[PDB]
Amino acid sequence: SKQQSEEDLLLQDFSRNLSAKSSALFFGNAFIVSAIPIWLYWRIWHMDLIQSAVLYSVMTLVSTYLVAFAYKNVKFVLKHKVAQKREDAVSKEVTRKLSEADNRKMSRKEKDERILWKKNEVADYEATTFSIFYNNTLFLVVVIVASFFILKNFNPTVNYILSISASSGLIALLSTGSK
Amino acid sequence: GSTSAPGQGGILAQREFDRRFSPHFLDWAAFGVMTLPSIGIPLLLWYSSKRKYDTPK
Amino acid sequence: VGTGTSLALSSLLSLLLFAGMQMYSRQLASTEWLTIQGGLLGSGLFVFSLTAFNNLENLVFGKGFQAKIFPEILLCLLLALFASGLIHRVCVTTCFIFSMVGLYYINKISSTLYQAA
Amino acid sequence: KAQRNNEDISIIPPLFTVSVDHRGTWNGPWVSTEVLAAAIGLVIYYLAFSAKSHIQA
Numbered sequence: 001s002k003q004q005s006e007e008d009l010l011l012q013d014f015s016r017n018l019s020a021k022s023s024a025l026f027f028g029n030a031f032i033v034s035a036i037p038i039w040l041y042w043r044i045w046h047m048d049l050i051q052s053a054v055l056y057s058v059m060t061l062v063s064t065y066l067v068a069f070a071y072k073n074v075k076f077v078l079k080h081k082v083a084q085k086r087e088d089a090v091s092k093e094v095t096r097k098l099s100e101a102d103n104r105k106m107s108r109k110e111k112d113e114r115i116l117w118k119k120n121e122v123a124d125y126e127a128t129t130f131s132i133f134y135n136n137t138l139f140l141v142v143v144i145v146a147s148f149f150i151l152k153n154f155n156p157t158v159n160y161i162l163s164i165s166a167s168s169g170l171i172a173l174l175s176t177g178s179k
Numbered sequence: 180g181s182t183s184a185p186g187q188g189g190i191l192a193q194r195e196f197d198r199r200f201s202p203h204f205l206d207w208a209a210f211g212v213m214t215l216p217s218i219g220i221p222l223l224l225w226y227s228s229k230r231k232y233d234t235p236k
Numbered sequence: 237v238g239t240g241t242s243l244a245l246s247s248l249l250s251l252l253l254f255a256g257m258q259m260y261s262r263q264l265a266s267t268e269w270l271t272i273q274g275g276l277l278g279s280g281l282f283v284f285s286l287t288a289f290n291n292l293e294n295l296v297f298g299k300g301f302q303a304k305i306f307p308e309i310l311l312c313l314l315l316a317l318f319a320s321g322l323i324h325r326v327c328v329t330t331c332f333i334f335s336m337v338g339l340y341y342i343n344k345i346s347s348t349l350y351q352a353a
Numbered sequence: 354k355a356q357r358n359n360e361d362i363s364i365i366p367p368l369f370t371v372s373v374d375h376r377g378t379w380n381g382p383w384v385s386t387e388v389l390a391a392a393i394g395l396v397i398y399y400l401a402f403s404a405k406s407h408i409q410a
Contacts, residue, residue: 078409082408085408134401134405137394141394141395144391145395148387149391
């Protein structure tokens with residue numbers, strides 16, 4: 001099963017369809033963050049949620065799509081570099097695991113596979129966790145500065161629509177610009 | 180003489196008190212707690228990973 | 237570090253300094269010592285802005301583009317001076333002086349790094 | 354008379370004194386300032402962005 005072993009993990013990462021764990025983490029985290037500004041306006045600005053719920057949700061759903069559209073692209077760019085930077089230690093961990101195998105006639109493809117398997121995991125993970133942190137940082141920080149300084153002279157309603165649409169849209173554009 | 184009369188008002192229940200203004204000036208601190216999963220948890224978790232593999236050569 | 241990331245980093249550092257200077261402009265101008273502190277901040281803004289401008293020039297026109305005294309260096313200095321005026325007139329002397337002192341060493345650093353290589 | 358003449362008010366011995374302790378009205382922890390909220394947001398963001406540039410290189 002040498003051919004399948006090397007393929008399985010590699011295929012799922014490179015595929016344009018998000019891995020089940022990646023999709024839930026990205027979509028859910030984007031949803032939670034998109035809603036967080038609702039609590040700012042609801043509490044500080046004192047904007048009723050129930051009466052405007054129709055608008056509130058629409059903008060939240062729109063934000064989630066763009067933020068997740070930022071997660072995949074931002075993570076992809078980081079993973080390219082991360083994998084190499086983490087390979088140094090991860091290679092030691094894999095080689096030690098292969099020394100335990102002690103396979104007399106181990107294939108060279110298997111030699112690449114094992115190291116590749118762990119190297120993929122770490123790059124896939126460290127990129128996901130860090131990328132989510134950074135993207136969440138930019139989105140939450142942007143709304144704070146824009147809403148409370150840039151939009152200081154506008155109705156809360158126009159402020160919410162402009163701030164949420166702008167932050168998410170710009171952040172998505174920065175995702176592709178990094179690539 | 181007679182003093183000014185505020186007139187009629189509304190007494191609520193404890194749960195409602197929480198849902199209009201509990202973190203009135205705690206709002207930003209609560210925002211940090213809400214954003215802890217979005218920022219604190221990923222950042223701290225990743226730092227544990229980087230420390231593990233980022234060994235000086 | 238990568239040129240594309242470097243350009244963003246320099247822009248972020250310059251932008252943050254400018255926003256802080258305006259926010260505390262009233263406090264900074266209150267006392268002579270605080271105005272001098274503004275001079276340090278303005279020079280730092282000039283240094284970061286110059287780094288960003290060169291990085292942008294390299295990306296658009298290709299790597300290795302050389303910054304000239306005019307207009308790349310002059311424009312960055314002018315922007316820093318304009319921010320200095322907003323807080324107080326007095327800094328324009330101190331804010332300018334710190335920028336010049338940084339510039340001479342920065343050129344010395346650039347010559348060693350690039351000309352030697 | 355002492356106040357209107359700007360004399361030491363303490364010279365007049367009070368009939369009795371009472372200490373009232375105030376243990377702080379609850380406003381939350383003192384991070385709820387709109388400017389500061391941006392200060393923490395931007396401070397965190399700058400470190401995060403630099404960390405990104407540290408990874409991308």
